[PDB]
Write an enzyme that holds these catalytic residues in place. Structure first.
Site, mmCIF file in Angstrom:
data_model
loop_
_atom_site.group_PDB
_atom_site.id
_atom_site.type_symbol
_atom_site.label_atom_id
_atom_site.label_comp_id
_atom_site.label_asym_id
_atom_site.label_seq_id
_atom_site.Cartn_x
_atom_site.Cartn_y
_atom_site.Cartn_z
ATOM 1 N N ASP A 95 0.791 -1.264 -0.121
ATOM 2 C CA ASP A 95 0.078 0.096 0.083
ATOM 3 C C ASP A 95 0.775 1.372 -0.002
ATOM 4 O O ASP A 95 0.491 2.227 -0.692
ATOM 5 C CB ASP A 95 -1.015 0.058 1.163
ATOM 6 C CG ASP A 95 -2.000 1.127 1.219
ATOM 7 O OD1 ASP A 95 -2.697 1.305 0.287
ATOM 8 O OD2 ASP A 95 -1.924 1.743 2.476
ATOM 9 N N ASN A 117 -2.567 -10.795 -3.704
ATOM 10 C CA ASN A 117 -2.128 -12.319 -3.761
ATOM 11 C C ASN A 117 -0.825 -12.795 -3.082
ATOM 12 O O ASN A 117 0.241 -12.108 -3.931
ATOM 13 C CB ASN A 117 -2.097 -12.964 -5.179
ATOM 14 C CG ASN A 117 -3.202 -13.052 -5.935
ATOM 15 O OD1 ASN A 117 -4.393 -13.034 -5.187
ATOM 16 N ND2 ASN A 117 -3.323 -12.165 -7.106
ATOM 17 N N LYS A 119 2.001 -15.371 -2.887
ATOM 18 C CA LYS A 119 2.416 -16.458 -3.443
ATOM 19 C C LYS A 119 3.347 -17.232 -2.702
ATOM 20 O O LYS A 119 3.588 -18.808 -2.774
ATOM 21 C CB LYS A 119 2.979 -16.159 -4.908
ATOM 22 C CG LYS A 119 1.932 -15.376 -5.710
ATOM 23 C CD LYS A 119 2.149 -15.563 -7.190
ATOM 24 C CE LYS A 119 1.042 -15.563 -8.006
ATOM 25 N NZ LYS A 119 1.029 -15.248 -9.194
ATOM 26 N N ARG A 140 -10.392 10.345 -11.903
ATOM 27 C CA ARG A 140 -9.761 10.454 -10.465
ATOM 28 C C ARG A 140 -9.057 8.953 -10.095
ATOM 29 O O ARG A 140 -8.689 8.927 -9.266
ATOM 30 C CB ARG A 140 -10.843 11.021 -9.563
ATOM 31 C CG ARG A 140 -10.962 12.706 -9.899
ATOM 32 C CD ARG A 140 -11.621 12.999 -8.662
ATOM 33 N NE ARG A 140 -12.812 12.413 -8.172
ATOM 34 C CZ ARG A 140 -13.223 12.037 -6.876
ATOM 35 N NH1 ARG A 140 -12.497 12.238 -5.746
ATOM 36 N NH2 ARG A 140 -14.274 11.175 -6.581
ATOM 37 N N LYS A 141 -9.392 8.078 -11.103
ATOM 38 C CA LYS A 141 -8.818 6.783 -10.857
ATOM 39 C C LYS A 141 -7.437 6.444 -11.423
ATOM 40 O O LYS A 141 -7.228 6.619 -12.319
ATOM 41 C CB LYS A 141 -9.945 5.622 -11.547
ATOM 42 C CG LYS A 141 -11.277 5.815 -11.108
ATOM 43 C CD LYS A 141 -12.352 4.760 -11.623
ATOM 44 C CE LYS A 141 -13.847 4.994 -11.809
ATOM 45 N NZ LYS A 141 -13.999 6.587 -12.132
#
Ligand code: 0ET
Ligand code: 0ET
Lengths: 172, 195
Positions: A95, A117, A119, A140-141
């Protein structure tokens, strides 16, 4: 105002070696090292452990490629399964990396989605490269994806996708 | 083995009053309080290292590495018949991300802790394979939330868990997540599944 994104005596040799290689990458300006600081009693989560104990990392940003690399060493206080880094400490550094990539590209954002994920488990006191890239922007994405790999890039530990939403300051 | 999931002076009134409510829920025996420790109990360390994975410490549980009040303050209650784990969580000042709010990774951490503990009740030793979080509303520092997780389906070694992060009154939904946990195959064994 202390910069924590610089070598200290908690840093494994692998982290020192990688840091030096990325500082060389910064020579022509194509990459750049991001300083990081600690922050009432409120502090940045990833900078709130003592040295060596929690998150040790430096981020390097490549603007031409809209790419963020996080060199990351997880201390004994980040443990989840015995001997390995907690899944939440992994999510945290993912993050922080994919988010900082979005933020260097386009300004203030907040995470809306994080899809991770796992792994292969990451050994406590290991050193990894989190390599993120901005894949596309849609209003805005901001769509950022990444992977966590061993220093030598042989082992794939994790893969993630994410969505960041650029804030509208006239609303928040 | 000191239990960190008991009230201490950092617990604000809402955490404390909501602990009392779930403690009342435990009287009929349908709910049970989990203990949590700063370090994994030695029986599980032994089991884990000896049968599963050993990579060749000051080591302590990530969620329990902060002194009183500064980091994660929490307690989990489990309902076996519902396959449902609820975590009462209060996030301290050291969890900050955006100014005034809890870091997304500290939210992911408490979500992972909750859904993960839910999977473990049903499956034993499991690890996170997928964690998919939608952050819908930001969570303010020092607020008390509830993480409500349930086991949705089991398929072989796959455990699918869902959860919600809500205010105490349940009217504000902060986050929702889904997740896949996988029961570890012992290091010396075959599976013997498709693939
Ligand atoms: C008491 C207190 C203690 C407190 C405890 C403290 C702390 C608690 C600890 C906490 O911090 C939480 S642990 C948090 C960190 N987690 C990890 O590091 C996990 C890393 N991953 C692994 O070790 C392995 O990948 C894992 C063991 C997960 C699976 O490795 P294997 O066992 O070798 O699994 P197979 O490869 O045979 O695959 C099996 C099946 O699952 C499917 N699949 C796998 N991954 C998937 C994915 N991402 N999406 C969708 N599907 C996925 C796969 O397709 C297959 O399905 P089929 O194709 O239908 O057969
Ligand atoms: C802050 C400084 C950094 C500090 C440094 C520390 C850094 C560490 C970093 C960490 O600390 C991480 S930041 C901390 C963790 N993040 C949060 O707590 C954010 C909580 N969320 C929100 O506040 C709002 O949901 C958000 C601001 C995200 C969007 O709120 P609004 O402005 O109200 O935006 P709209 O809701 O109108 O939606 C906008 C568009 O996005 C789409 N969408 C939304 N969510 C989605 C999802 N989950 N999947 C897929 N799509 C999603 C939606 O469909 C819409 O699409 P269109 O309608 O097609 O256009």
């Amino acid at each position: 105002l202390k910069d924590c994104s610089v070598p200290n005596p908690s840093w494994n040799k692998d982290l020192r070696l990688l840091f030096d290689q990325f500082m060389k990458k910064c020579e022509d300006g194509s990459w750049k090292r991001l300083p990081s600081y600690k922050r009432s009693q409120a502090q940045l989560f990833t900078r709130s452990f003592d040295d060596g104990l929690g998150f040790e990392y430096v981020m390097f940003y490549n603007d031409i490629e809209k790419r963020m690399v996080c060199l990351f060493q997880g201390g004994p206080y980040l443990e989840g399964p015995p001997g390995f880094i907690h899944g939440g400490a992994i999510a945290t550094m993912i993050d922080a990396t994919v988010g900082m990539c979005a933020m260097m590209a386009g300004g203030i954002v907040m995470t809306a989605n994080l899809n991770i994920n796992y792994k292969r488990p990451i050994p406590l006191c290991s050193v990894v490269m989190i390599n993120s890239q901005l894949d596309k922007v849609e209003g805005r994405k901001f769509f950022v994806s990444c992977n966590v790999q061993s220093v030598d890039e042989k082992t794939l530990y994790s893969e993630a996708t994410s969505l960041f939403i650029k804030l509208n300051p006239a609303k928040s």
